[PDB]
Design a protein around this nucleic acid. Sequence first.
DNA 1: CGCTCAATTGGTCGTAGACAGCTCTAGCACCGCTTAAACGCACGTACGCGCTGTCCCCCGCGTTTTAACCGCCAAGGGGATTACTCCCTAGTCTCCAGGCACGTGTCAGATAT
DNA 2: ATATCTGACACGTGCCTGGAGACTAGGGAGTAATCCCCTTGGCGGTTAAAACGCGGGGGACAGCGCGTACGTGCGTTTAAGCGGTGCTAGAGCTGTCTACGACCAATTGAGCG
Lengths: 91, 108, 34, 49, 92, 81
Amino acid sequence: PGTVALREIRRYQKSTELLIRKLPFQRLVREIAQDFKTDLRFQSSAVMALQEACEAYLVGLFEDTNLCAIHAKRVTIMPKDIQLARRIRGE
Amino acid sequence: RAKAKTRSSRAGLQFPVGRVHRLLRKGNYSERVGAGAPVYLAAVLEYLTAEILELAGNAARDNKKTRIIPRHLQLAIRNDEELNKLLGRVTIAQGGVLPNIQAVLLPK
Amino acid sequence: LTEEMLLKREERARKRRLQAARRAEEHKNPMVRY
Amino acid sequence: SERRDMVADFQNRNDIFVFLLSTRAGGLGINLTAADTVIFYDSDWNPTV
Amino acid sequence: SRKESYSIYVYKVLKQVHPDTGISSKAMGIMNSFVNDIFERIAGEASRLAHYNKRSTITSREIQTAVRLLLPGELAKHAVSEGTKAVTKYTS
Amino acid sequence: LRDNIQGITKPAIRRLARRGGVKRISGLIYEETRGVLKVFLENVIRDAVTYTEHAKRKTVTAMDVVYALKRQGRTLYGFGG
DNA sequence: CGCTCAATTGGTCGTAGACAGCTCTAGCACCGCTTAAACGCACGTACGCGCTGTCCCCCGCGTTTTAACCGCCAAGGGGATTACTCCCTAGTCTCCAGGCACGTGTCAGATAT
DNA sequence: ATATCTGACACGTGCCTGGAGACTAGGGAGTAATCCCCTTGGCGGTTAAAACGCGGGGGACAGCGCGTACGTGCGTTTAAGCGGTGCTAGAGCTGTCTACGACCAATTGAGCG
């Protein structure tokens, strides 16, 4: 079989909530803020605005990577498809 | 002096022309604001907002729903190339993505 | 039929009385051995 | 809320020797009749308080 | 104290198209964001047009031009027609 | 500890990939994505803090990040500003 | 080459959360109306650097036939999916606790009614 | 000179922000089975590649003339404060219906014949 993942696509495209676990994301946001500068602290709405921008940005990256792999006649993504998707965007 | 009423009502307009007349001067965009400019901008904002609000209500109608959510607003953008261009630099909170498949993914 | 006109009050009213009560009672109170 | 349980353990028990009060949070209406004695470590600038 | 937003006004305008329809608090925030984004676009574009003309005045023609750089499709000329109607009916 | 960005879990990155519409995912992709995810915050948190440092506040507001996202060309609705 | 079977996608019941009309309040900048500043629309008046056909050689193009390459054929074996097995940390929700702001404090000692 | 003022300067409690603890149970991480994939690599109908002989027109003038620029006139432009007072968000609270939960049917993908 090896292909019913196509039903996951349709489920997670029907769904529209945020997908990364809030605590892990908040821990990472704080860790990246705290080694950047002292005593920066985030309102919940700022962490949510960050996470929505991140996940929308990654959905864009995966759509772009999909078209790179489809263009390469693949049905699979490798890190090189992401590195094209960065250089072709200028990222 | 007379009992007050909105300047929008004489213009034929649905948004607050008075605070548009405030914003256009208070935002330091110019030294002077022409008497038509806030009426014109209210009319433009109303026209474009009503045009997308029909698509919002139609997106909910298509999904057979009665209460608008950000998903219906994302569907309203992805139902019109003018909005897909205009909002091409916009993120919609909880709006998700349009459901789509490249034919290569399909069995047979 | 007719009961729903009262249920829309009393189903909420029993909850108000209970919530008032549960608020008010806080508001008024190997190895080895040698 | 906290002002209750500390009073409820000081009244009605012999478990504690001493209590610390500010002249102005403690001074009004608490009725600590379990106490025999009082020490003003400070007197206030407003007399009779 | 008040915070400058359009919540009641967009729900007033909804009756133009869908009187049957409700709005979630989240969706109200999205449409509040839409109308002020289009303001920041047009007010900046019209001010840059006015700067290139060095004029003290903004006018119906600054915004008529700015809308044509906001949108490529005929929704621009329809919005421009709605602005010229409204300014006419206001001044008559 | 799990602080090595691996706290962004394999199935969570895979669910973002599934919403993104991609089919077979090679096992290095999760870690390549965690690399991009750091760099996106090295743009966005960094500039959002330069807006927090305009007022020099301790609290980061949703406005502070929306201004950074606006200068970085990825505007966001629902939070206002 | 079209069945039987083991599983969803989709349907009906449920239950209380999340709207949107109150139901007013009362804060305020919108709307009215004169006052007053200065430059917008008007507009000559300087005189032009886009276009109109002469003279002459430049660049693009068709044609030709090598020979690299993409589209394709099938197979190669290792790494992504489908699914079970088990370990932990995301979320709940709790109490703890402290910074920002507001307010009474008060009476002193610095300033003026 | 005197009334009494404006700091000195502190602990009152409000608000919410913000942390860490102990629990369930959602879901993440570990793994084979095995398939089916990205990938390696020969095949010849088809076009990249560059001359020779050549067509389409790029190129540099002379100067006509339908528009372009300056920058002051003069009457029409918005400015500008501050009167009244309707709109407007706060916000207090429903009064449900609407989208999201809990129990189980029509339709699909998998197995191989």
